[PDB]
Amino acid sequence: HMVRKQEIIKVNQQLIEAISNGDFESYTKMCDPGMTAFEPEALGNLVEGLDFHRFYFENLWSRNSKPVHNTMLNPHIHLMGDESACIAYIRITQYLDAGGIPRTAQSEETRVWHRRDGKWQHVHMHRSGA
Amino acid sequence: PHMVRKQEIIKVNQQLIEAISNGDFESYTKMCDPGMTAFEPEALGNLVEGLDFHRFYFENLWSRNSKPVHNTMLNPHIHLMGDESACIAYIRITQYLDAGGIPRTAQSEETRVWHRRDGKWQHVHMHRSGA
Amino acid sequence: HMVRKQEIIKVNQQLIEAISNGDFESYTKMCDPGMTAFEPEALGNLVEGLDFHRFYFENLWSRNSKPVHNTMLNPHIHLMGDESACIAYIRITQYLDAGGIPRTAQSEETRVWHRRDGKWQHVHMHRSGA
Amino acid sequence: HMVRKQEIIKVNQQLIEAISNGDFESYTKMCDPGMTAFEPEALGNLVEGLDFHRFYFENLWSSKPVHNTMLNPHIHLMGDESACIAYIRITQYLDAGGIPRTAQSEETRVWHRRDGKWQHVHMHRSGAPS
Amino acid sequence: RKQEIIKVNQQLIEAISNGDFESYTKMCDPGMTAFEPEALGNLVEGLDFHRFYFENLWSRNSKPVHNTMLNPHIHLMGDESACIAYIRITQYLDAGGIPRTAQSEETRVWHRRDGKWQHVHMHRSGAPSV
Amino acid sequence: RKQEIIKVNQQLIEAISNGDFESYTKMCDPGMTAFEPEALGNLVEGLDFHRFYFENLWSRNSKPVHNTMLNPHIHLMGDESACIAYIRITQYLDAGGIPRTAQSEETRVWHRRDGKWQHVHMHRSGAP
Amino acid sequence: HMVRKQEIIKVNQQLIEAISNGDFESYTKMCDPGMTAFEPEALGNLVEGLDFHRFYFENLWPVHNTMLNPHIHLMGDESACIAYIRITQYLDAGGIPRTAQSEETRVWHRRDGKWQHVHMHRSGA
Amino acid sequence: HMVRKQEIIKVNQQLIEAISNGDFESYTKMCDPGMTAFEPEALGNLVEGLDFHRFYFENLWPVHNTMLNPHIHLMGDESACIAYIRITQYLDAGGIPRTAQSEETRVWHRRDGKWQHVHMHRSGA
Amino acid sequence: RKQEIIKVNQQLIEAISNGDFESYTKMCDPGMTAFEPEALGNLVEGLDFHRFYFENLWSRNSKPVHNTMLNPHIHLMGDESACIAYIRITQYLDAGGIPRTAQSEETRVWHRRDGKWQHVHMHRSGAP
Amino acid sequence: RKQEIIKVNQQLIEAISNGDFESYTKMCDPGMTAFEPEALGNLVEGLDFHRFYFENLWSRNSKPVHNTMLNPHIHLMGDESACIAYIRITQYLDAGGIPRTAQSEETRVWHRRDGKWQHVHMHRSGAPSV
Amino acid sequence: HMVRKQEIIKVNQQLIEAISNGDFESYTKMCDPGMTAFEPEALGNLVEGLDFHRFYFENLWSRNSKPVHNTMLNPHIHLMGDESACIAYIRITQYLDAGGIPRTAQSEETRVWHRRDGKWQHVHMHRSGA
Amino acid sequence: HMVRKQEIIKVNQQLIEAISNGDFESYTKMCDPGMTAFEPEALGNLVEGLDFHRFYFENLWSSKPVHNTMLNPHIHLMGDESACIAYIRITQYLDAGGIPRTAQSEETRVWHRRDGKWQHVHMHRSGAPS
Amino acid sequence: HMVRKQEIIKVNQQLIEAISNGDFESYTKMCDPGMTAFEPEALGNLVEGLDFHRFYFENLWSRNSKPVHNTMLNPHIHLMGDESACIAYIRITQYLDAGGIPRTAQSEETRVWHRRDGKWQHVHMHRSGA
Amino acid sequence: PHMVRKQEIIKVNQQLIEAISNGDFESYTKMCDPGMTAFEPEALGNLVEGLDFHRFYFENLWSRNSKPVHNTMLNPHIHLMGDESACIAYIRITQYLDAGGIPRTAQSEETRVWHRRDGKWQHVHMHRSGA
């Protein structure tokens, strides 16, 4: 069990890493093309596909001049058979504002994973917090 | 068989939402895994584990007829992950009567994750944002 | 055209009359069962069917019979064949507040009508404003 | 009818891209000369004709990348020559400071088949002005 | 001439004050238009809009009000039409019985049909229904 | 019949935004009156009060501006008098290039003299 | 000219009194029928005072008025102008004493032996 | 009495002009040395106008003044009272045209053949 | 010498809060003047303006009230005139029983006539 | 008598306006007291408090100010002391050169020592150092 | 190790239980009399002894008519030898407000324990959050 | 001196309990008749004597349980007959609604040994008024 | 007494003079090394030694030599033997803001002095106000 | 021996506070247990574990001379728990120069827990409230 929960923890860390670096290629590689997302930026609408996030990679997140640290705190992993997983955690984002003063942001994240063709694929996420 | 499964998920999710609406904590526990986790605005950004946190709301806020309420599930999107795993995401509109008796409306976004154990669907994780 | 446009004005006036009265039975008759609606009380979501609207008739507009007057201001009508119409207008709703002071509320309304089996049926509405 | 619903989808997509690209010539091509419009920039008034929108094409839309996405389109078909499409629209843009923002609007657009071509006869938009 | 326009205009205002809707309808063309603050910046046609204010306030209150027509200016265009413009001062009592005053600017257009002057358009700017 | 009043009224509105005081005087009876927000609730008589705004604004600030009369209602009173009432939508650019829109309600009274329509009174409420 | 100035204060004092108690017939006797008035209740317009004030006498009217620093301009045998700060002490329906200040200009004309009020200008309250 | 009323408007018009351009010597010629004034700049006090206004002529003073609805009370051969709304169109240092309204009462006295300003009362701006 | 001015000034202050208009008149020259906030910036002359406040307040609202002159400064000018300036602290109960404290600054000018000090002018700033 | 108190009081105010601290000290008793808004509700003794305002503002600015003494009231108590009370109006220019006006109420007490009047106490209420 | 961390978890649960019930006796029994506390109610001062908390037991917390649930989330326990422990956790308080509407509060708590005479004693606490 | 510092502690504690109990007789007993006081209720003024404080004893302190605690007292000894004690004071009380509140003040109290008895000669309190 | 009280006034005036000048060297000489202080910039805490005060001399009152005047208003002095004194007064600090406008600040000050080896030493201060 | 121990705790806590003041992350790690936990306002009410969260602040905000600062430890209270465990609680006043160069002041309350491992004190938990 625990080895499989650490498997989900690893790929989710890699997923958050592509967000911090702005690596949309690795982000796409880990996401199922038909994934859905509930996100504050989407104004309460469910968004399907990776278009809504590509616009954030191409602009705000590719400004990689700034440094960012994303901490996953106390991830709770639900295993549902050998093929499905759901991980839930508090996400702490450390970044620099305009002027270079360090600041932190909190968001709660639920991410659902399904293993398709022997590879973990991210099929649905839900984030709350600005 | 996936089309029939999606309708099984919608119905059991509908029944979970009405058990909450009527404060039916006996049916709520019937449908929930004992180790289910929850992100909801009432938990102030914390993940709560088990049905302990919700029991306080069933015992002190939800009666089977405390006030009229209408909970609409808008365009649910269902991910089926193999044979016995499902994720359903939907916008939920709540029509309620406020303190002054005025009909109002509230929107929340809900993800609910279900796992089928020994032939029955069990709720294992929910994430609610909004109202 | 002028006789056909006056037919759409008349059934639309009856629909708005049913709303002010609270007569949900006539409102239902004039609306196709699968009508859709954009209106502020839906918080930006498209609602289907008369289901969402029962709660506002049954728990309000029936209330305590205080006077409510509704006016269609200079309606614009688009005729699309002999079986379809779109009508758009400023709606002025006169009402009495808690206190008895006469007040006015403005909304912009788009209402789409379909001629189904002899009878005009309300198929889609879009309201913005108060 | 399934072919018709997809025709309404494509012609509505083409109208949205013409507004996003500031292409007033294509917008005029797809629009009936006597079309009406409820939209926030008109301050709660029904405007008729393309003259009101030409000011926004020439002096604005003709600047920065904009991502206009159509969410969950609902299409009512009234006969073979009339249609009404309603959807939520999410606009992704860069503000004055270049930071990506998102804005939601609800849109109703009514189309009329004229001489073998769909013609935009009425629109209703609620949400934030551009 | 001009004293006849001042006369009938005084009767109309006095009919408004008394809640005398019968004399008001007798003086007003049934197709008159009105620009008024209560209309929220819209042009209202007909007599039913004001009838709501008559039947639920002005005919409801015989409480003392005094209306002053200050230096009316009258344009006579031919023999059968006139336009009178004036400052209107309304003295009245508020909720606590305090005497209050309110200023509005009024334009009123009169058309003599069959020997009797008929009110066909009014424009009021200022405080609403005070 | 009503299309002539619409045409003459649009020309008066164009001459206002083009700072064209000459065309404005040609269409206005010299004894015209006006209720408008800039007059602070007073009735102003003649063409002198508007000249100050023609010289120091509508001319001086000439920029892309579009004025629309929305669904005008015309009262015809004989064959020599007319009252046109309409919502007036002003599309302009603010300092900074951002397109803006302003609404006002306008009543304008016209009188026909020697085959020419003359503007005798206006009333404007809303945006100043 | 302290003698004729003292008469203007006297007749102006009776005007305030007839106002201060709600007596309209004394007011109407002392006021020319074509009297004009600028005052805060007129919202910046010149008004015929008698038609405008009868509403305040039929409805609005422990009050103490006080005329501070009366300055009188004498103008022949027929007219005079008196300007002064007017202080008003009153009970505000809550029992509390309040004080209000207004500046008043009052013009008087003696047409047929009697002084009649011709024009007033009040500001401040 | 439209003839003698037209003269009061004329001399009052020259006063506004002498004020509107910053000419103090014309103002001083037309003003009685004991002229009094209520005006917003006096903060509710009656002031000798000539001593008070010279500061506004030495410092404060594209402007268009307009006298609306002048009402003139004639009072014998020596005095008259003129009341009117005064509209002022000006440039607010930002280039934008603004409009200000004031209500003015002006009392005039003809002592030695010439009309001299005796008392003014302005409110509103 | 200065203790006599302090004593007479305290008595005037006590008579003010006790609604004792009779003792107030005995200590005040009938031609006294007063600058105080209730007079809205005007100088009031005599004893009539204060009587309205004696009848409708300081009497009517008689309740526990303590008035303290804080470190009075006395200017002696001959043997017949005195000016005393001090912070005046008013301890009272509001509606509801809550003890409150108000401050004002007071100048009071006294003139000795026939062996008796007479109050000729006061100036108060601060709490109304 | 009283015109002598008005005279010396005018000189003092004119010394304040000119920043003329030498003439100010000559007119003021070195043990004078003052109640002033700038003192924040405290009684100040001596001349050094005002010297700060002289040395860092009034002697710093020859910018135009005009002071008006309105209807001074004077109490004469014997032969060697006087109290003058008056409204003071101060005309001046602000930062943008706008002419401004300010009212304060002033009481000033004068003691004639050795034939020369000496300022021993002042009380000012109103606007601070305007 | 883990059995000893569950030992600290147990007595800390019992400590929070006395707070929820208002049981000052059991609270005193578990606390060292010389314990210190950093608490928001103490306004940023360190408080020693159990006096500051007794006043809260005797009033707000002994109003046991209301129900309260106190959840200790993800306790992290530091063991420092066999005699000392430090537990840190997020504390969630569920309660009823005036009117009976359920509400939740969050506080972060650090609590230090020392085993004296074979019994765990609470020697120092630090709480943040209202 | 160690005995002296504990004498100052006890007599200061007795003064605080006399204020808390509203015992004006004991307060007068421990206070010098010419004592001075800076405290917020005096609005930033130095008051002399016990007369100012008698108003607060008679009309207030003479109601509800109050917990006045002395935090970290610092005592300066100046000879054998003079002392100055400074401390933070935390007041625990029930407001109008009975809910327990806490208030902080900083207190300096100066004591003088007179005729073999310590006498309170000066106090300075900053913080919130009672 | 009067000569002894004037000695305390003089050394206290020198201390306040050193503050306005920023002369930290004389300020140190007049202060006992272990003096304590209550002042607003300490956020309610009692600070010991001149340590806390170096940061405010060295980084401010030295600054750019703009004028600063300080006045002791009617000081009250308590003499406690021949070796101890407490002085209390309103302090008025005149200063120039950024912009050159003369402004005033008020504070209440208690300063306790100890005669140690011939020289007066400042042993405790308490300041409230600005 | 407890009096000497308390002064050891004060000194090592003083050194930890100056390593933070000068951004000395090499000394900070020397004094901290690798599994130390922290409650601080920057963590938004969350317990952070390890020195990872603080490393971002050393690397981007704390230099050895970025600005003058004075950190006063007010009246520390030290609990000694046996031979090799200590808890120190104190109010901390920070004197800093703000953006405009104005000298300001900030108060925080700090608990720091130390464990003596193989002869050296190691910081294992901190809780900061306030500024």
Ligand SMILES: [K+]
């Ligand atoms: K179950």
Ligand SMILES: [K+]
């Ligand atoms: K077309």
Ligand SMILES: [K+]
């Ligand atoms: K009629």
Ligand SMILES: [K+]
């Ligand atoms: K013309």
Ligand SMILES: [K+]
């Ligand atoms: K005009």
Ligand SMILES: [K+]
């Ligand atoms: K007397």
Ligand SMILES: [K+]
């Ligand atoms: K008086």
Ligand SMILES: [K+]
């Ligand atoms: K001198």
Ligand SMILES: [K+]
């Ligand atoms: K005693």
Ligand SMILES: [K+]
């Ligand atoms: K280490």
